[PDB]
Symmetry: C2
Subunit: 130 residues, 2 copies
């Protein structure tokens, strides 16, 4: 099934073997565009739209993303899940939690890559229960 | 796969044929206890824990529920998803949203049934997109 990506080693590609924690069969008709992998979410930055710490984000592999969409982004090795808001050579990664602040990126100054598009969420896949 | 239950007709059993909107293959190792069906969530009463309107709740069929757990309950034909807090002949169904109020049930006065245990959530299964 879909590979589950855990915390990503700095600079290391998302689907690097060390990152995969397992594989889970998920009906492809569930999400659109189709989910290509699952990514465990770190933190509550997107809690207001129901994306909680520990959730498994369903991600479609693409870089064809538009403003307003929730994306998986990599900024200087750090991988994050935020709402995209680009404007010229400036990209804003907005949270959905007032305890967090927007992340502003200067395309000229730092390395920025869209890893994928959030197309769903699966809550569970608990690493504590047998 | 797991059957998806849409809005439930008053007094009608959950898995009544008219309620099923489809079936989705979901890896059984994903949830524990195992998910037996999916239930579309109506409203934002559980938004603070990330259960949003339109989410598909993964439900384990059982009545073996304990205080503190999120359950699917039926009170006088109405089916709801809340956190259980029972005390004698009085059952409190608590929300996770300040815009909502706790639902107090008198076991002697009204019909109350535990339909199942919430074991997960799948967000998507959009009825608008082809």
């Amino acid at each position: 099934g879909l590979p589950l990506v855990g915390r990503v080693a700095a600079g290391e590609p998302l689907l690097a073997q060390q990152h995969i924690e397992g594989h889970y069969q998920v009906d492809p008709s569930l999400f659109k565009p189709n989910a290509d992998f699952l990514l465990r979410v770190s933190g509550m930055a997107m809690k207001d739209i129901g994306i909680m710490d520990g959730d498994l984000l369903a991600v479609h592999k693409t870089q064809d993303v538009r403003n307003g969409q929730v994306v998986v982004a990599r900024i200087d090795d750090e991988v994050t899940v935020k709402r995209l808001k680009k404007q010229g050579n400036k990209v804003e990664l907005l949270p959905e939690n007032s305890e967090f602040k927007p992340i502003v990126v200067d395309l000229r100054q730092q390395s920025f890559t869209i890893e994928g598009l959030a197309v769903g969420v699966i809550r569970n896949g608990d690493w504590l229960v047998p």
